[PDB]
Design a protein around this ligand. Structure first.
Ligand SMILES: OC[C@H]1O[C@@H](O[C@@H]2[C@@H](O)[C@H](O)O[C@H](CO)[C@H]2O)[C@H](O)[C@@H](O)[C@@H]1O
Ligand SMILES: [Zn+2]
Length: 472
C-alpha cells in the first residue's frame, strides 16, 4: 500500500503534523499594507542576485488568499501550520512605529487558523531583517540586536500570545552566518573578497553569537513577563544535515564528528550545555567569541524545544589536523566532502544540487541528538524536496518522487521515535510552491502546486498522500 504502513497510529499519541511556509517566501504584498523593506527585498531587487531577477513582491499572494490556504491544509488533515511573522510588516523601520494594518493581517490569520482547528506555530524571524536595521545598526554584527529583537519579540508576545502558544525565535542561523557572512551569497553579501566588505573567518562567528544572545534575551523576556499568563513555549529552528564517516577509520570518524559539531553543535552545545563545542574552541580559538558565565547561564536551557530542519546527508573523509592561517568558517572544519562510498552515490539528487535524497539521514540526525544531548524535545520543523522549473501542471501534480521521499523519510523518523527519541511533531516544507531564495521560482518544494501566472493552487499527489496518511 502507498502509505507503507504509515498512519497516525504509527506515531505517538498527540504527535503533531503540519506544513510550513515563511513570510517573504509566500505572503507577497512586500511593499504594500504598510510593510517596510527587508534585506531580502533590497537583495532580490538587484539584477543578477536571484534566478530570473525574480523577487517576493507577489510570491504566492497568501496575504490575500490565506483563508483558501487554511481551508486547504485543514482538508489535508494537518493539525498545525508553521509560518513566520515579517518583522518589517509589524515595524516598518524595525523599531518605533507599529504598522497596525500588518498587525491586523496576523491577527486575521491566527484567528482563522484557530477557527479551523489548526494550531499556529509561529517563527518571529525567517531571514527577513528590516532593511532599516541593517543600515542603521549593521544587523547581526551588532550586539545591540539582542535588545532590538527582544523589543520586537515582546510586542509579538503581548499582541498575539494570548492565542499563540508555540513560538520559535530564529530559522537556520547557521545558514545566515554561512551564506550571509562566509560565502557572501545571501544578504548582506559579506565575505573576505566581497564588495560589501567582510571577513569570512570572523563574521560568521560574531553573527552566530549574536543570534544565540538574542534568542536567550527574548526567551528571558517571555519567561519573566508573559509566561505566567500565557503558558506557552518558545524554541529555535536549526538546520541539521547528517554527516556519515566515509570509512570506520579513526580519521574519517573524527571528521564526521567534527562536521556535526561545526554544523549543529555550534548552536546545540550552547543551548543545551552552556558552551560552544570543544573542537570549535580548540580550532577557532580567539575568533570564537566567549560567553561570560552569566551569558552562558542565560543561553543554557533557553529553548523549550529544538526545531530541526532535516533534508539530506553527506559522507565525510578526514585528514590530519593542521595548523593553518584562518580563511573561513567553512575551512575551519578541516574536513573533506566526498560524493560516494564503495562506488555508489549517497543518494539521487532532487532539483536543488545540495539536496541528496537520503532517508536514513533523518534517523541519523534524530538518533544523534537523542544520544548526545540528553534526549531534548525535538520538532522536525522542515523536511521536503523540490521539482525543477518549466514542467507542465500535470507533471508537477504527479509528484511520485516526493511521495516516495515522504514515505521513506517518515519511516526513518518513526524508527528513531520507536527507539525512544523525544520527537513531538513533524512539519513538511512546504505547503506551497514558493519563492526559494536564490532559486526564485525555479525550485518547487510544495505539496500544493502554485501556478505562478494565475496564482491558482492545485494539490499534488503528495498532498493527497498526507490526507490519506493523516486521516483522524
Ligand atoms: O530550501 C528549502 C527550505 O529549507 C530551508 O533551509 C534549507 C536548509 O535546511 C538546508 O540545510 O540547506 C538549504 C540550502 O542552504 C536551505 O535551503 C529554509 O528554512 C526554507 O526557507 C527553505 O525554503
Ligand atoms: Zn492579491
Amino acid at each position: 500500500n502507498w502509505l507503507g504502513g504509515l498512519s497516525r497510529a504509527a506515531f505517538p499519541k498527540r504527535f503533531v503534523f503540519g506544513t510550513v511556509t515563511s513570510a517573504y517566501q509566500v505572503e507577497g504584498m512586500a511593499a504594500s499594507g504598510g510593510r517596510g523593506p527587508s534585506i531580502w527585498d533590497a537583495f532580490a531587487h538587484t539584477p543578477g542576485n536571484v534566478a530570473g531577477n525574480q523577487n517576493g513582491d507577489v510570491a504566492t499572494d497568501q496575504y490575500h488568499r490565506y483563508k483558501e490556504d487554511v481551508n486547504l491544509m485543514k482538508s489535508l488533515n494537518f493539525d498545525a501550520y508553521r509560518f513566520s511573522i515579517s518583522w518589517s510588516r509589524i515595524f516598518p523601520d524595525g523599531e518605533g512605529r507599529v504598522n497596525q494594518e500588518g498587525v491586523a493581517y496576523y491577527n486575521n490569520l491566527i484567528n482563522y487558523l484557530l477557527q479551523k482547528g489548526i494550531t499556529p506555530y509561529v517563527n518571529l524571524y525567517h531571514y527577513d531583517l528590516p532593511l532599516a536595521l541593517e543600515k542603521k545598526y549593521g544587523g547581526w554584527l551588532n550586539a545591540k540586536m539582542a535588545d532590538l529583537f527582544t523589543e520586537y519579540a515582546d510586542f509579538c508576545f503581548k499582541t498575539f500570545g494570548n492565542r499563540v502558544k508555540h513560538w520559535f525565535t530564529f530559522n537556520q542561523p547557521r545558514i545566515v552566518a554561512l551564506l550571509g557572512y562566509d560565502q557572501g551569497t545571501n544578504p548582506p553579501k559579506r565575505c573576505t573578497k566581497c564588495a560589501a566588505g567582510g571577513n569570512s573567518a570572523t563574521e560568521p562567528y560574531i553573527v552566530a553569537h549574536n543570534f544565540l544572545l538574542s534568542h536567550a534575551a527574548a526567551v528571558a523576556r517571555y519567561r519573566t513577563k508573559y509566561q505566567a499568563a500565557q503558558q506557552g513555549k518558545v524554541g529555535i529552528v536549526l538546520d541539521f544535515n547528517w554527516y556519515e564517516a566515509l570509512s570506520n577509520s579513526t580519521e574519517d570518524q573524527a571528521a564526521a564528528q567534527r562536521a556535526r559539531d561545526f554544523h549543529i553543535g555550534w548552536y546545540l552545545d550552547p543551548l543545551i550545555n552552556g558552551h560552544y563545542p570543544q573542537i570549535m574552541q580548540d580550532l577557532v580559538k580567539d575568533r570564537l567569541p566567549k560567553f561570560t558565565p552569566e551569558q552562558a547561564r542565560l543561553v543554557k536551557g533557553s529553548a523549550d524545544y529544538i526545531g530541526i530542519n532535516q533534508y539530506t546527508a553527506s559522507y565525510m573523509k578526514g585528514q590530519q589536523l593542521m595548523q593553518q592561517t584562518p580563511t573561513s568558517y567553512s575551512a575551519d572544519w578541516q574536513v573533506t566532502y566526498v560524493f560516494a562510498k564503495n562506488g555508489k552515490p549517497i543518494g539521487p539528487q532532487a532539483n536543488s544540487n545540495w539536496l541528496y535524497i537520503v532517508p536514513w539521514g533523518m534517523y541519523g540526525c534524530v538518533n544523534y541528538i537523542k544520544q548526545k544531548y540528553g534526549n531534548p524535545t525535538v520538532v522536525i520543523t522542515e523536511n521536503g524536496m523540490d521539482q525543477p522549473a518549466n514542467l507542465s501542471r500535470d507533471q508537477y501534480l504527479r509528484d511520485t518522487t516526493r511521495v516516495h521521499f515522504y514515505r521513506s523519510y517518515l519511516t526513518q523518523l518513526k524508527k528513531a521515535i520507536d527507539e525512544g527519541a523525544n520527537v513531538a511533531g513533524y512539519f513538511a516544507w512546504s505547503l506551497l510552491d514558493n519563492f526559494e531564495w536564490l532559486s526564485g521560482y525555479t525550485s518547487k518544494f510544495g505539496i500544493v502546486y502554485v501556478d505562478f501566472n494565475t496564482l491558482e493552487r492545485h494539490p499534488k499527489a503528495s498532498a493527497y498522500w498526507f490526507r490519506d496518511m493523516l486521516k483522524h
